[PDB]
Motif scaffolding. Sequence first.
Motif, mmCIF file in Angstrom:
data_model
loop_
_atom_site.group_PDB
_atom_site.id
_atom_site.type_symbol
_atom_site.label_atom_id
_atom_site.label_comp_id
_atom_site.label_asym_id
_atom_site.label_seq_id
_atom_site.Cartn_x
_atom_site.Cartn_y
_atom_site.Cartn_z
ATOM 1 N N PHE A 22 -6.220 2.813 7.403
ATOM 2 C CA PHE A 22 -5.025 3.308 6.717
ATOM 3 C C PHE A 22 -3.813 3.448 7.641
ATOM 4 O O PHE A 22 -3.084 4.438 7.584
ATOM 5 N N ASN B 4 0.799 -1.226 0.000
ATOM 6 C CA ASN B 4 0.000 0.000 0.000
ATOM 7 C C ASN B 4 0.833 1.279 0.000
ATOM 8 O O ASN B 4 0.319 2.357 0.306
ATOM 9 N N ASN C 102 0.945 9.945 5.844
ATOM 10 C CA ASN C 102 0.082 10.993 5.285
ATOM 11 C C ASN C 102 -1.156 10.490 4.533
ATOM 12 O O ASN C 102 -1.957 11.301 4.062
ATOM 13 N N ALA C 103 -1.318 9.174 4.408
ATOM 14 C CA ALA C 103 -2.560 8.614 3.876
ATOM 15 C C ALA C 103 -3.707 8.949 4.824
ATOM 16 O O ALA C 103 -4.752 9.445 4.398
ATOM 17 N N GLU C 104 -3.499 8.692 6.113
ATOM 18 C CA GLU C 104 -4.462 9.086 7.137
ATOM 19 C C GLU C 104 -4.680 10.599 7.115
ATOM 20 O O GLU C 104 -5.819 11.063 7.163
ATOM 21 N N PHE D 139 0.762 1.646 4.501
ATOM 22 C CA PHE D 139 0.488 3.017 4.068
ATOM 23 C C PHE D 139 1.536 3.999 4.582
ATOM 24 O O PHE D 139 2.122 3.807 5.650
ATOM 25 N N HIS D 140 1.759 5.054 3.805
ATOM 26 C CA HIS D 140 2.531 6.209 4.247
ATOM 27 C C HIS D 140 1.707 6.926 5.323
ATOM 28 O O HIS D 140 0.478 6.942 5.236
ATOM 29 N N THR E 105 -0.060 2.669 9.209
ATOM 30 C CA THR E 105 1.265 2.450 8.629
ATOM 31 C C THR E 105 1.669 0.976 8.678
ATOM 32 O O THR E 105 2.409 0.500 7.815
ATOM 33 N N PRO F 263 3.027 4.579 -1.358
ATOM 34 C CA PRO F 263 2.602 5.607 -2.309
ATOM 35 C C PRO F 263 2.883 5.294 -3.776
ATOM 36 O O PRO F 263 3.894 4.665 -4.094
ATOM 37 N N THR G 198 -3.939 12.436 -3.013
ATOM 38 C CA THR G 198 -4.801 11.381 -2.486
ATOM 39 C C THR G 198 -4.549 10.079 -3.248
ATOM 40 O O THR G 198 -4.389 9.020 -2.639
ATOM 41 N N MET H 251 -1.294 8.668 -2.193
ATOM 42 C CA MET H 251 -1.340 8.063 -0.860
ATOM 43 C C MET H 251 -2.119 6.747 -0.772
ATOM 44 O O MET H 251 -1.700 5.841 -0.052
ATOM 45 N N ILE H 252 -3.248 6.640 -1.475
ATOM 46 C CA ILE H 252 -4.101 5.442 -1.371
ATOM 47 C C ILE H 252 -4.498 4.791 -2.706
ATOM 48 O O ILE H 252 -5.320 3.874 -2.722
#
Length: 479
Positions: free
Chosen positions: A261, A93, A270-272, A267-268, A263, A95, A192, A195-196
């Motif tokens: 979301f 997941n 900054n996704a959250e 996820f990075h 880490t 970036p 966005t 990120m996702i």
Amino acid sequence: GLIVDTRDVEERVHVMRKTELAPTVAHGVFNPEFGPAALSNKDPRLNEGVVLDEVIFSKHKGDTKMSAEDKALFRRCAADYASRLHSVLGTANAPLSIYEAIKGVDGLDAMEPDTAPGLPWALQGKRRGALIDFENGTVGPEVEAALKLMEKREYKFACQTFLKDEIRPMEKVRAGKTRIVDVLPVEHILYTRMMIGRFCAQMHSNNGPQIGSAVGCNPDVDWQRFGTHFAQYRNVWDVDYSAFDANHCSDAMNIMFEEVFRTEFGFHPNAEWILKTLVNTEHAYENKRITVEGGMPSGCSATSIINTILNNIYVLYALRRHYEGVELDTYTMISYGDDIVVASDYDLDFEALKPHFKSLGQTITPADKSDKGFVLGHSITDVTFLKRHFHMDYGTGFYKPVMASKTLEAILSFARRGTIQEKLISVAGLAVHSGPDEYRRLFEPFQGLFEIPSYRSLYLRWVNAVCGDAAAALEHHHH
């Protein structure tokens, strides 16, 4: 959502437009109770007392603050759903690159080169192409600068209220119930997706009841898969919400973003963060700036995915709030945004779930709109999903997505200028499942003027789409 502030400003963001839709040859034949939404206050079809900006923001009637106990329950449900989700999809997941975010990847469409760029670019007279090179997948210095602010969590923005140019039921049209697209800045949509977007691609590729999501499905192919699954259960319910997107409370949104979301799921961080920027938003409409707390901005990046995830968590939450011992295998469901089909072998009392959905700020009703409310014993062949019924094809014995003829008539009665031929091919794919007689009737007004696919050609296309082995098997024996 809760409107917490409304103020007037000097800069006017233009909202009113003229419709690109016009009646087709079919309009005179079918005479549908549908028409283009009002895109102006001066539209003579509007009822007396209708102020267009007030009606479009009338859906924002508060941000439900859940109890501490209910938030704790909601988090457990969000985490349990997230566990299922990431178990199926995996944790790849990280970036997307700027190139991948612009151009797309397997399971994620490319960004639109010439759609609205959002603010403040619309005020400066800049199109998306002036900011982003969509052919080469690179960004200019303005977008670069904005991306750095997002990296540092210092980025702020306003949403541009865009009136949705579309056909609606005439009762809705005259009441000024024109739907809106909250156009966020192109760089926000880009980030966005960075990120996702990978997660969204995997969601699309693994759509089904296991993850409870139909986003990215192909009804032609997947109605067989969905239908066969839901046919196994004793009870099936299809549920309607009222203003699903608007009534997502900030608590539910925040907790969902926090649990889905993480880490630890790849996820990075900054996704959250970038998802949380959707919770408290400023909306620009002419000289007005309206600040709204809670609710999902409509028609934005990952709106369908986000709405679908929340829908899954809501069902788990509602059932656990009423019953003890409820787990993910107590029921099954599939969702696409606010649309949902649920099933279970247990006689679940969905009428009793109403107050539990109300604790999330959501109002549920049966899709059938029957007296009393929800009932047991309904099957997959009784419900609607994505405006499609689950009917059995006599020729193959596979499920096919059948739309109501009145819906198809309404769709065919209007079109954007210069797009009719393309639209007819698309709508023909929808109409084939209604059978040869209905297919012929629906397209009769267009014959001669446009190329209409033969029923036969689309039927054979569909058989192979659903089951290649079945299509091959039909050629084994000599006629």
